[PDB]
Amino acid sequence: AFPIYAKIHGREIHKCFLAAAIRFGLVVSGYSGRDENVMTMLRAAIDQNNAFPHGLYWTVPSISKSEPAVQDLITYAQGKGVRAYLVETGTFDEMLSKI
Amino acid sequence: LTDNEFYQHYLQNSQHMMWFLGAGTSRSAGLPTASDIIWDLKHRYYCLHENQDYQKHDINNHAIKSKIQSYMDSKGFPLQWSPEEYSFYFELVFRDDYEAQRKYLLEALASRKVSLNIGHRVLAALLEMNQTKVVFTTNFDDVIETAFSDISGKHLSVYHLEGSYAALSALNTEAFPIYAKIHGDFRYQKIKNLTPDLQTNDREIHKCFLAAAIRFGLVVSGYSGRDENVMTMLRAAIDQNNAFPHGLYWTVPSISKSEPAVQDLITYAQGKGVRAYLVETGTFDEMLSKIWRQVKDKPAAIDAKVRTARVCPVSIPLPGPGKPALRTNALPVVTQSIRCGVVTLASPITFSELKERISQKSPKALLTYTVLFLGGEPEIRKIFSNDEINSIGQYYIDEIAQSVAASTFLKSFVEEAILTALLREKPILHRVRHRTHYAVIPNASAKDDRFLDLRKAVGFKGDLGYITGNVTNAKELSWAEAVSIRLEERGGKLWIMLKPEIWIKPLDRREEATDFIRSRRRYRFNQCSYQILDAWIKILFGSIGGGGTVNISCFPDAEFKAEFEIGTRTAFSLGV
Amino acid sequence: LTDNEFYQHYLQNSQHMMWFLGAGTSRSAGLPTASDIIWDLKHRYYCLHENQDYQKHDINNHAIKSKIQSYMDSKGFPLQWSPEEYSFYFELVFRDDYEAQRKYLLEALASRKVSLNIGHRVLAALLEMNQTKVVFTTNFDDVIETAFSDISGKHLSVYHLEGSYAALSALNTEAFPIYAKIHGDFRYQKIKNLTPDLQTNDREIHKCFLAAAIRFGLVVSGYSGRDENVMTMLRAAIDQNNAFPHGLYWTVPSISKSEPAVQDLITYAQGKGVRAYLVETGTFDEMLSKIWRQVKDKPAAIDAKVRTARVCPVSIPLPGPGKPALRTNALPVVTQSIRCGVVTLASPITFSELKERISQKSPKALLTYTVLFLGGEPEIRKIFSNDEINSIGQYYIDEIAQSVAASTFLKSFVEEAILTALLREKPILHRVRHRTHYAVIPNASAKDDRFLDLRKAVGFKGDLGYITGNVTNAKELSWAEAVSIRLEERGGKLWIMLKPEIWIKPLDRREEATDFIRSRRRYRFNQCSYQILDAWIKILFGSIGGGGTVNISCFPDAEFKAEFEIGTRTAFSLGV
Amino acid sequence: LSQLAAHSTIPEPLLLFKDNRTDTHPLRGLSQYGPYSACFNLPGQVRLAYLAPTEHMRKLDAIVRELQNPATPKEATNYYVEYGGFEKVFKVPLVMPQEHLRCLALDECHGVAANGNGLALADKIVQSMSGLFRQKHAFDVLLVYLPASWKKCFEYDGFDLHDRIKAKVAPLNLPIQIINDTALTRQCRANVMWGVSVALYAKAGGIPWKLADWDKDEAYIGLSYAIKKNAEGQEYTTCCSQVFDPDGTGFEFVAYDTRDRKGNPYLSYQEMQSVLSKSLHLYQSSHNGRMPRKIFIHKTTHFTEDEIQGAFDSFSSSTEIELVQIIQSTNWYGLKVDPASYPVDRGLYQPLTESECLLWTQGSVMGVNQQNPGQPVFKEAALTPLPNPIMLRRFSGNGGWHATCSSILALTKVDWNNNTLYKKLPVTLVYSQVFADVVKQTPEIVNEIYDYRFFM
DNA sequence: TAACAGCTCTAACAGGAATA
RNA sequence: AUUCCUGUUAGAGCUGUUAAC
DNA sequence: TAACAGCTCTAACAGGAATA
RNA sequence: AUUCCUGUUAGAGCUGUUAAC
């Protein structure tokens, strides 16, 4: 019964995020990580057999300015076999306008 | 979990429902089951070495089955319906020749013996009308590939082990409906049917089962267990977050005969937090029939193929009356539309209550429930006071035949109305026996001129007969000529049925005159019966059966009057 | 080779015919072509980098196409419709991402925009009814699969590159019909659509084609060459013993625009001893329509789906006359069966010849050809001598309406017969204008009492009117009231059409009185026209239009007489 | 056996007007409310221009002045309504052209007319338009006048001057309102004024009135043909018109060719499929890609098997197709009884056979009488004493005679070129026939499609 | 689930013999 | 029960149509 | 392909004005 | 050609039904 707008406010979303990661891929914008709760949330979402089938896309205004944890997670996902990517775009609003 | 609650749950959420049909469903499709395949293989094996005529002895005979099984046990082969037997006999007959094995399995399960039944057609309709999106199967024959082609008229995307990664992509891009065979089509080289092949799972398909686990809930039918690879794939699917959003509904034809593996898997799933339930719903066919019955707003185009019995066949037209002609007893009632009166009651009423009110009050009108009354309003006021009557209005029956066919209350009401009309202005008495109305010559007025023709009808050798009197050897029984008159709904027409009878004045003492009724009717042959029917037509209608359209109205002096018109000539048709 | 000879050759031997359909049939199936795919890719590519609104400008506009192509040429890309462009733009847009390329090609050619036309349905019918067994295709979308599923109701076995060798086995075990896609379904990982993939052929599919060459003859349609791998596979198939038992029929929509590769391949095949012929048969759809037309004994069950226009739709029933009612001019002819006379001629006769014999002899009878005559035999003896007459017998028209509808000769004959019957015993004169019949008040007998009601009909403000006379400003033109009477076949019924007209005594001088005809008809409003139609009904029938069934016979004193019965009341229907 | 199926009279269709008000009388509503398209400013002001010989320009300025001032109806006062003055009734000023917005035809046109050469006369009339073409932005509608002395070239075999002029100036985008001497010498004046004014407003801007109760998801199609008498044989030039109410407020009414040679007016499989493809592609472009759900293809002649198959195979299964044939000349004719003084109410449809029905596009109309309100009006009383109905022979449909009959009735009332109350045929058929005449006269028009305001 | 309407069947008896 | 199916006396079974529960 | 039958259409003209 | 469709005079187009070729 789409669409839903759930706020993490960071376990009731943990299972929801896991099922959603099973369903379809994720693009994350405006987030630099730095939070261990959502970090473990996403890392736990990655492990399953078909997680983010379309791909995980961490979009930041500048690639070099991103926190090291984001790149570490991207490399970990790529090693696991998932198709996670780190792409450099503009501001989130400008990215969405171009989309 | 009771079956009805399972049906409500499914009906409640059938949009997101994977199906897992096993080899049990194909059992009905007419395809040989696993045991039938084993027995066929044993038949070929025994007939081959021990040189015996193949067609001379059948396979479903009890004696030949016992003899072949005894021969098989003689060479130390597995005893009876035990594991590692089906694969054993396959690998014995075909001595590791997978091409010949594939060809035989294709021939046995070929697409010429398959006759789709309600179950596969209903599942294919669910696929097309898009409630179930994924149908996993461990089964080789196109039992459901064919059903979808027959119903939808569209090609179905079947997935197998030849590619085996198509299912994951199609699942990811939502290319529903997908029908992924966990063991692949028999057309292809890999079949994965022997026990050694049944221990492993294809990585990409296995991957698909887990991704599809999160999206939908599973209903598995016609699966008995006994497969290690599918069981471990299901167990792995359970051991993941929100494994089944709609619960795993494992259905078996009989809970008592279910294997313990299914029950322990259900217990494990319940221990892992999912709401998996084991239910018994009878056979797969009955289950799917009920599921389709509970389906709402099914498209007519696909339902004309789901249930071919629902559409009306054999609408074979009748020819013309062109070119000896039987003369039946049916008078066609060409009246198409009538007017009736309706009374609205402040409190609900029962047809039985109205019948007893008729019995007590005995009004000069007719009433039935559906309350439609024919006659005068003051009679209804006698039956029903002003307090219980809200309003009195009119009712129009545009199609009388369809109305009487639809509701038997209308049939009885119209029959009573036409009977009252026909006997309204005539001396012939009106009685009832069981629920059949009888127009009988009265005792006193038996000397009327209008009965004289009837007197000619019963007369012997053309003399004057008798119409009413007393039985030859009865104490008080009185007898008379009569006609049973009924209303018959035939197709889109209404007819009046007249049958000559010998009415007996005491209702319950009819049997004592049986011999007399027999004796009087011994020689009522075709000519005599023709004469009696003509005389009765003249009595009941007043006109001879040539080109007449006599019209009769019941309660002509009443505000609500029914005016019927019945052709005076009975039905006839010249031979072709 | 002319197209008609090709059709005859194919019809003579249609049981052994492979088909070859690559990217040419898909043009007419409602799915984009190669050029459309290229232009779509260019549209996405241009809109992506140069940030432009995607939906703001379309793709089939000429200006936008020119602008996008100019942009593409700006970056040094290939110029226009040149080789290595389609694959080039695919590999440019998708930068070697075969999964995304597959997903896009699936979305563009998906099974929702496809609307099967006559060509694919006819080919699928040929597959099911088992004339063509092998249908090779270089095409990805499931047009033939959907057509076969829609028509046969059975799942079709599609073969591709994933399995690859599956098709060869099916050929060897005669598992027809087989539909092997030389480039495979888009539902699978390998699509073999780019130019680098188009240089090689799958070994097993190559072997399958080589083996199928010997068994059947090939008809290739909607294929324009340009593919090296398929061309070399065909050339290798030619270079083997009895390469094609039924010849390679290469069909193109236009021989002039055919690529030279096809022509040189045909010449090479002819030099290698096979009877390969290149023909032009127009589009694929028209070709298959003609081929299906020449098909004999096509099953009704599949033909009800091949040509949905052949079955009669819109059989929407009409309601009852229940519950202002227009009163038309149609008198229903309830006569169902009539008797006519037939004469057998020793030599064939022409309807024109019979018409001129009527003109010369002017007999007191009616005749038509189908020779059915209505009237007296001696009149026919006057028309035809004994030498030319073999026998004279009877004819029965059981269904008059179906007979007149089927043959217009019967329509004219029955119209003339009913016209002669209606004016047989009445003073009203019978004339004809063009192909219509007019009953006109005679000049001399205009003072008859039976015309007085008509005199009332035309009268002004209720006084006495005029029925016949001379025009106000004409030298010799004479005018009279008249009715045009015609026969109309409506559904399963026959009706007589009456229309009030002002007949003019000189046939060719009618226009000179036009104003008068206008002036006399200026104020013939609904009431006046109602009166005139009632008066004409009374004149033509002798009974007022209430509950009448007047019967009229033509030539009552003749052995062959037609007895019609027309209801005296015109058609009416109360509003709902 | 003389009792037919019960008919139902479809009520008079409502017409959307100024401020979305509905009134089934077009001219009365125009006087009372105003044009539907006047809600937005599509025409800022109706700037006119004149093209006529120097001698007869006074007639043009006189008729323009007559349009400026109100007029009263003299003939057919039963239906017509008093003119309120262009500025008052259409709520937009009517601008008289200045000196440079008023051209003069070449005197060589008179010589060509005396020579009796229609082609050269049309070419010269078009070539006279260059003075206005240097100021094409200045004016909206050009009033081309033709003196009676040119009658010899107005209409003769293998030619028609009006169609040639329309086809020559259609690609040049300038609307043209041709005026003959007939419009001058017609007895009544309000007749000519109403007709010319509504034509002028439609050609300068558009949509004087729009039909209400119109589902946006139905596209109506009408095919009609014309004959060019070749020396050896004949040429059957058939063209198709399309109407639909799009998502935007601007109701659309277009026409287009169908392509080579046709010997018969029945389209083959490929041609029918191509025309239908162009039609729903046009609808999709006007509906941002949304598929039409109901399609009505009205044809003056019966659909062959090929045409029905092309219709079935061109669309998808989701879009039901209503293939209907319209028969103009029929034997049947009815008379209303309660017998009535006035003929049967307009719009009554009588189902004769499971596939054939009578529709009374002609007949008495209720609620549009100016004098003695409540009396019925018969539009064709002058021409005929009784209304001749048409036959609808449905060739493809799922169910419902009312659905197609009401659509046809509403399509018979939106002909802005028609001065009278309604039309005997749907606007689809009449516009397809007009464009068929145009294409038959000028074969080099098959490339483009055109809005109604060009040819009405 | 309780009545009511019709259509049709079987379950027990009884029962006489082919247009006179 | 050599047969045949003609009636009598009853009850069910289906359909329905209401009132419910 | 040549006639013949009906059903229906357009192609040229002409033509008068809404129940009197 | 402000309009409307009422008629006249013709020819085609489809269907057919025969005779063929």
Ligand SMILES: Nc1ncnc2c1ncn2[C@@H]1O[C@H](COP(=O)(O)O)[C@@H](O)[C@H]1O
């Ligand atoms: N009506 C039915 N439809 C489908 N499967 C059934 C049905 N009845 C029984 N089965 C199952 O079929 C299985 C036999 O499959 P197999 O082990 O291949 O012989 C058993 O486990 C049954 O539970």
Ligand SMILES: Nc1ncnc2c1ncn2[C@@H]1O[C@H](COP(=O)(O)O)[C@@H](O)[C@H]1O
């Ligand atoms: N309707 C059609 N029937 C038969 N062939 C066609 C049709 N349309 C296109 N073609 C052929 O298909 C070819 C294009 O296929 P390709 O360019 O190889 O994908 C053209 O060269 C045409 O000859």
Ligand SMILES: [Mg+2]
């Ligand atoms: Mg105009």
